[PDB]
Design a protein around this ligand. Sequence first.
Ligand SMILES: [Mg+2]
Ligand SMILES: [Mg+2]
Ligand SMILES: [Mg+2]
Ligand SMILES: [Mg+2]
Ligand SMILES: [Mg+2]
Ligand SMILES: [Mg+2]
Ligand SMILES: [Mg+2]
Ligand SMILES: [Mg+2]
Ligand SMILES: [Mg+2]
Ligand SMILES: [Mg+2]
Ligand SMILES: [Mg+2]
Ligand SMILES: [Mg+2]
Ligand SMILES: [Mg+2]
Ligand SMILES: [Mg+2]
Ligand SMILES: [Mg+2]
Ligand SMILES: [Mg+2]
Ligand SMILES: [Mg+2]
Ligand SMILES: [Mg+2]
Ligand SMILES: [Mg+2]
Ligand SMILES: [Mg+2]
Lengths: 237, 322, 46, 394, 102, 158, 176, 124
Amino acid sequence: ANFVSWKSRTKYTITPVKMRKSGGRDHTGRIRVHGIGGGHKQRYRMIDFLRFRPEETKSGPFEEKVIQVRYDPCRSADIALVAGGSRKRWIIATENMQAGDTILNSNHIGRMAVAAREGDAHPLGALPVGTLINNVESEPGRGAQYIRAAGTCGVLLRKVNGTAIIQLPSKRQMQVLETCVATVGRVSNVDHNKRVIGKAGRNRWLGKRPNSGRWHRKGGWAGRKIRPLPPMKSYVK
Amino acid sequence: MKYMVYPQTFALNADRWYQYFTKTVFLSGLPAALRAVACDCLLQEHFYLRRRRRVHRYEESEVISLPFLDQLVSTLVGLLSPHNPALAAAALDYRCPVHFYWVRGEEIIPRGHRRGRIDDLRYQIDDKPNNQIRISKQLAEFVPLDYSVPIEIPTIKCKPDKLPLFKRQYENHIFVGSKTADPCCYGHTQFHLLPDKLRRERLLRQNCADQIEVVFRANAIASLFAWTGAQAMYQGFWSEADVTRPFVSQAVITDGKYFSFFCYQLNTLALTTQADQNNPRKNICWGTQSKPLYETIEDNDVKGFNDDVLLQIVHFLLNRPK
Amino acid sequence: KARGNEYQPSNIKRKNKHGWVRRLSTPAGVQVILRRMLKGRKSLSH
Amino acid sequence: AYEWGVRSTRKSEPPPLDRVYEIPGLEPITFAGKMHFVPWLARPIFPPWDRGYKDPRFYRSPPLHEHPLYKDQACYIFHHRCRLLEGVKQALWLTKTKLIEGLPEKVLSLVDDPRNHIENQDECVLNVISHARLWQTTEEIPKRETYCPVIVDNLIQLCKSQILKHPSLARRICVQNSTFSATWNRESLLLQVRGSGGARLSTKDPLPTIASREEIEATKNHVLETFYPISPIIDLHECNIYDVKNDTGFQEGYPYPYPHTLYLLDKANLRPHRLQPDQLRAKMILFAFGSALAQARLLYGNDAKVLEQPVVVQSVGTDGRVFHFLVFQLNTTDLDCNEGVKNLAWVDSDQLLYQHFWCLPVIKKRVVVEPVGPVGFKPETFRKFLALYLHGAA
Amino acid sequence: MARNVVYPLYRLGGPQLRVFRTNFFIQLVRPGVAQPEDTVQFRIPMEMTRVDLRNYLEGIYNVPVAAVRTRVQHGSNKRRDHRNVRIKKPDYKVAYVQLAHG
Amino acid sequence: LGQIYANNDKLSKRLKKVWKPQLFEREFYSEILDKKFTVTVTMRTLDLIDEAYGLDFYILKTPKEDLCSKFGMDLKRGMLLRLARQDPQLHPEDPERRAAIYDKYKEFAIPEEEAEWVGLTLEEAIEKQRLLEEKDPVPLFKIYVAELIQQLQQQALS
Amino acid sequence: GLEEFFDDPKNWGQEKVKSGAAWTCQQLRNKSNEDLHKLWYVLLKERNMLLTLEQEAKRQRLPMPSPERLDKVVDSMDALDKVVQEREDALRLLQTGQERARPGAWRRDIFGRIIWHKFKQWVIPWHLNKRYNRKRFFALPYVDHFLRLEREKRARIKARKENLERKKAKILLKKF
Amino acid sequence: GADRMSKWTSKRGPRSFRGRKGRGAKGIGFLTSGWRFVQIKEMVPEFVVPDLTGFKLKPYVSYLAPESEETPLTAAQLFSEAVAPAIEKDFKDGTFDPDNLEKYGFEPTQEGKLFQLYPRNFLR
RNA sequence: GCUAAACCUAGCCCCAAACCCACUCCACCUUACUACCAGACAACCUUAGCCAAACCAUUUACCCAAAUAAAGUAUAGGCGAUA
RNA sequence: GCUACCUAAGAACAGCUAAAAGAGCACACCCGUCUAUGUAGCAAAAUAGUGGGAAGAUUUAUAGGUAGAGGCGACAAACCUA
RNA sequence: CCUCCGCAUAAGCCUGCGUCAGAUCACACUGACAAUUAACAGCCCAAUAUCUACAAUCAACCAACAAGUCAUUAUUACCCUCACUGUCAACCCAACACAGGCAUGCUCAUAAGGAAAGGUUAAAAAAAGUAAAAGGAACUCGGCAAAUCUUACCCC
Ligand SMILES: [Mg+2]
Ligand SMILES: [Mg+2]
Ligand SMILES: [Mg+2]
Ligand SMILES: [Mg+2]
Ligand SMILES: [Mg+2]
Ligand SMILES: [Mg+2]
Ligand SMILES: [Mg+2]
Ligand SMILES: [Mg+2]
Ligand SMILES: [Mg+2]
Ligand SMILES: [Mg+2]
Ligand SMILES: [Mg+2]
Ligand SMILES: [Mg+2]
Ligand SMILES: [Mg+2]
Ligand SMILES: [Mg+2]
Ligand SMILES: [Mg+2]
Ligand SMILES: [Mg+2]
Ligand SMILES: [Mg+2]
Ligand SMILES: [Mg+2]
Ligand SMILES: [Mg+2]
Ligand SMILES: [Mg+2]
């Protein structure tokens, strides 16, 4: 096969970039994932998952105006066009993010905790114990990989040493350094799990090919399994 | 399948062939502030307007000569609207199409499953004059319907396809520049700029001095026959119900420097074989040889402004309906 | 339905599929051309 | 952070170097002498190559810092494709301008008088609309890229038909393909306006001033509005390779040197490619400022001063259905500070000429609901168009 | 122009491509169909350009030439010999030269 | 690459087995060439170098069939040429060390003409010979000028 | 003009037009370069006339008056080409010592045959040329068996030709 | 199936295939902008045709001509008939410098020449 | 008496001997048989199975460096087939 | 180059109901329920009539991809050149 | 008298009902001689950086969801021309002058395009229709077919 990935662009932009679907096929052309194929043509709106990203030639905490809250085909969350200085970028909208707003991106860890306003990005050492948090990093400066889907929130449960422990939406505890940045609140579209597809055709519009007709006998894996909760996952060496 | 006819053509003696296809007799001749404004129009596009991009000479006929022509038409229509009160209500168009479709003559299909069968020879002129002024009332009639003209139309002993002419099958359009619901259906003066392929310099390099006037005449005959026949068919005249009054229109064709002036009079649309079996009406096209408007434009001044070429532009535009 | 019309010709496909450059692009295709020169064929590729 | 561009799309490193190049004293044996690659010999190190001669179709430009007009300070450039985030008030900050709602009473009064109207005016403008939107081409529904300049040209000619009544419309011309340039400082920021596209109503007579010197000095108390956190230069090309020269667009001695009305068109067939109304008004404001500044710098020098003779430039901006009208008065060229005399701009925004056009009959339930033609005509909008056209000669 | 010879590459700013002894050989052919009075029909090689037929006729024969058009005429491959192997009638170039000066 | 019998049992399955060496990346210093080399080696090469008392001794004593390395034989050629030319680039400022390390390995000194071809494969040797025998052609003008002059010398003698 | 594409009008339909001997290569060697250039154009105009006449003879289904004229003009220009090429070859061999005008090299191929690659003219060098580096001037080790089979076929054909040679000789000695 | 025995010409294949293949005429220019063709005069072959007024050589030779033995011209003959007089007449006078053969005609390099014999840069 | 029938020569087979084949011009790895442009990728891995063992599962001759002879011997091998 | 599924960028869908539709009637178009004819046939699966769908998980043109110890499958052990 | 065709483009094919001469269902076969002419179509473009949130649907109102097909600027570089190629036919894929397959635009209603009967007779059996007294599913596995145009209900 000849499969070049569309993920080729090297410069951040807010322009929607033309994507190329895969069909569930690898770079060898063979199916690796079953069930993927043929939805509506979708364009990619690049998301900046690093909220504390000062503009070139600037240094510290900075504010950005929320201009638009838009629909994203590529995720289950809404996205927010925000702008500060001479830069516009896409971020993940919080639950009550409205257009014309002002949000703060901060890197300051004070002696006191801050009154956590929803939508604002603060360090986990600046956040109070018990704050509903979204978009968290595992290392300082890695960017947000966790708590990103719609309506998802995690909880700051304990600030100990230079570490901040959190509850991930699978109810799993995760320990990181306090200098990691986390947005406050819940991700938008909190009723996304109450959507009704209603239609096999709507699933094909979302790009989900139907399930296989072959009957499979259930195995030993199949019954209900009450496992203990996994131990806390640490990213602090 | 119809022959595409291009008024602005590279083919030699296309005036004679177009005279056959349209049944036209060509007859040589015709049936201070203005100077300052014309010289301003030339020097605005040649010296003053600072151009960011270097103008290559392949682009000159589209960057310099075209804006000079429609600026000149706009200014000389606005300034002569006092003297001619119809030019105030006239409709000035910039690069609008003028289509005409007609049938003239028969052939017998030479090969294939349709061999031996009568086929009409259909032609379609597709034109886009640079400017065109369309009045709401028809102009006067130059010469009377049933004029004589002991001159005789050219004939060809050869298929129309030999003067490079090709066939295609597309939409048959008959348009004057606007639709049939436009109140301004009649035509006044058309303004044409010959393209960069058909320049005097190239037509001297390719041993076609004889054909400098040919392309002027051919563009005139094809363009004015197309616009004037379109007007007649907008009034509801065709080959089996011919024109009861003569339809006229004039045209200035230019290369940027040299200008020629033409007047056409459609007296017939009966160009098919059955309608032209005993038709004595012949369409007429009067015209003049090309003349330079200026000599050279040296920095900030026109050397050889010929006020006669302008007085002819002024008189054409000063033609009015009765 | 009725069979036999399985060849739907397309010159781009016939040159991309069984042409000289594809043949030389694989070593096995090189041996296909070598096998045909040894047999003495007048049409080594398409 | 996440970095854009995946490894499989990023170009690969060359193969690791043959070990014979690390063994000192050895002359490696390569395929350079065979003039063709061989898989069983060392890969040579070819020296860098240059053509030596200049081939225009294979040119390679110098690095950006080695360009002659390269400056370490940034000049922020507004051109015809800049779309301001904050729009009108960003333009007002960038041009040091006070906005006044509506057009001047001097202008709206030139047509309040009823001998300055056109004969059968409403039907003539309806014919212009119908020709632009229905009768223009062989296509059933003409597109915006055709109908918008057609409607503007035909409105200009319909207004130009009043040379019977006013024999001072003969000192005008409508220039296309004209480009102006103007550069100014603004809170230690270097801004440039490169104005291109549209029509320039060029006249021999300067437009008369609108506000008295008492109103001009009364502008010294309006604080320009700021829009934190947005930088005043959010959507202007940050250029580093630029020149600073004023340009009216016309070499010296042009017969029609004064800007009267800039005609700006939003012709794009697609709504994302069309400007929002606020952005279009902002573009008109900065273009009128650029023309006025270029005139002031041409005639009065590169000095910074409150202008003894203010410079008036108008602009009409449209997409073919909605119109906006602007009159701009340059009262100063001392712009680096936000305090003192401000410029003035009278804006009549969002003036419909017609609500809708039906190019085909609307036949619902076999009865013609909507007839063909314009829906919701506004002769007040046309009267404002004529007033701006007859400003200066009526 | 010439057949079956390598042409020297031209780099911008270089000498004129000059041929001294051309191996281009043409035939004046009677037209099969009716043609205008200014048209002369030729059979020319496949590698001869209309710019070079004009230059050839104006340099060697001093014929003023106004227009040149060319087409490629296909020869039949339908005919078969006694071995059922198709015999190819060749392909040639036809050129229509419209004379100058009337 | 070989086969085996399941559990040392000839009446069991014959299966395919590949036995690979333990490969170690390590750095070596060559005294003759004065350069550190990072080479993937086996624990065998390490002892074979310990028994040789040095990397240079291992390279210069071990022949091709036991070196089993194009890198090893190119190293042997470079080392053997630095020795043949008494290269004054080995420690250029310090000829006493240069002489001492050259005297330590004097026993492997071969002529330079027989050292330029050590470790060359046949394709590299064919290219070497072609490059040294290239010889752009001489003009027959010069040839016939020499001929005319020799015959005119004979005529001038007569 | 075109009257030079046709013959003399008094020769039209004369069923035989006499001629003269074709130019011999030694006579063309006696003449100089400029005269050989002019004679090339004289012979070129004659060949164009003769080819025109032969095509019109085919058109009218009549014999060409004398085809030996066309054959002899082709021989004359072949001899002229030979003379000019010999003069250039002699000067090239004198001045550069190279025996061919176009550069080239003996190279191998993707098929294992040894070929005379004639060089092409390029503006960029070969290491930067795309298409040139796509071409393979080397045979990978799967070509040697086909080379051996090709040699064996050539040996099977030669042995056949030489056995028949001897069989034919014995049949001749049987008759005589 | 398709015909794989006839010659592949530009008459076969789709539009793109037909326009991209030609018939072997050499190029006389390049393509730029809107598929616009720029003809370069120096890439157009110029026919160097001599004056034929006063020329005594006709296309055929008279049959009353003496037969001549064929003698292909060699580099030895060219040396003996072109530069050998100069070299002999300069040696007998005694002014042959064996380093300046450039005066006798020798071209050291073929670069800088308009008609280079190797590699050949001139048409027939 | 129709259809027919007859026919000796193309050539071929096995050996012997002997080391076989590549630049008229031009074109040809791109869609080969294409005058003419910024690249670069690059070769090396034990055959297996039919079959025989009257199934099959370890096993089951495959030129490897002039004849002969030692010798179907020593050896090997579900100590069987066989080697 | 058939077909199964996919990628890229395309195209088509009259009229009526209701205007909300993997909505109904209904062409073109896609399929193939039932019957008759045909059964070395027009056809190595067709014809005539009758039918299912026909703005949709639709139909379809072009180029590309996945290859046999495999691929692909809304599982018929379907389809991967009669 | 039929017209469910047709005329173009695309794809495919590659001289395959043009002229002359000639033989042996009924007279598109063989050889020769000719022809398709560019404006339609193909064949495109200097670099580096930089820019590009606001569907389409008559785009207006209006409602959406599955969230979409069309945009630059700055600074260097840049003189020159109308080359090359496709263009025919009764045609392609199905072994065939095959009742099959075959994309798009117009005409879809004809100005294009075509012919169901070699001549006769008028038996059976068979095919395709049309009409049929009285009856009206009695037929048959079954209202299959045909004709009408039509109710209610199980199981899945
Ligand atoms: Mg979404
Ligand atoms: Mg998705
Ligand atoms: Mg499921
Ligand atoms: Mg299931
Ligand atoms: Mg067995
Ligand atoms: Mg047995
Ligand atoms: Mg439906
Ligand atoms: Mg339905
Ligand atoms: Mg399926
Ligand atoms: Mg099942
Ligand atoms: Mg089953
Ligand atoms: Mg074109
Ligand atoms: Mg045709
Ligand atoms: Mg008919
Ligand atoms: Mg019949
Ligand atoms: Mg019968
Ligand atoms: Mg009955
Ligand atoms: Mg009943
Ligand atoms: Mg019964
Ligand atoms: Mg039934």
